[PDB]
C-alpha cells in the first residue's frame, strides 16, 4: 500500500527508534482541503 | 449502522468480487469541506 497517515500512527520520534528510516508519509486530507 | 466511507475499504473493483452489489456510501468529510 501507499504509506499514508491513515496507515500509520505516531509515537515518539526518530531519535528514539533504532532502525527507523527516512520516508514520506502521504496526507490524503491535504488535497481535499485544497479543492 | 449506515454504510459510510469509514465503514468500508477498497481493494480492487467490482469486476473482482463475485457477489458485490450496487449501493450508496456516505461521505462524512464532504459536508465539512462544503463549509
Give the contacts of A24 (CB within 8 A, at least 6 positions apart): A3
Q: All 3 cell numbers of residue B27?
A: 461521505
Q: All 3 cell numbers of residue A15?
A: 531519535
Closest CA to B6 of B31, B28, B34: B28
Q: Is B27 on the interface with A (CB under 8 A)?
A: no
CB B20 within 8 A of CB B26: no
At which residue does the C-alpha cell 515518539 appear?
A: A12
Tell me the chain A residues in contact with residue B29 when contact means C-beta distances shorter than 8 Å.
29, 32
- C-alpha B10/C-alpha B25 separation (Å) is 12
Q: Is B17 on the interface with A (CB under 8 A)?
A: no
Q: All 3 cell numbers of residue A33?
A: 482541503
Closest CA to A20 of A2, A32, A33, A8: A8
Amino acid at each position: 500500500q501507499i504509506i499514508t497517515t491513515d496507515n500509520t500512527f505516531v509515537s515518539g520520534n526518530c531519535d528514539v527508534v533504532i532502525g527507523i528510516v527516512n520516508n514520506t508519509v502521504y496526507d490524503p486530507l491535504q488535497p481535499e482541503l485544497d479543492s
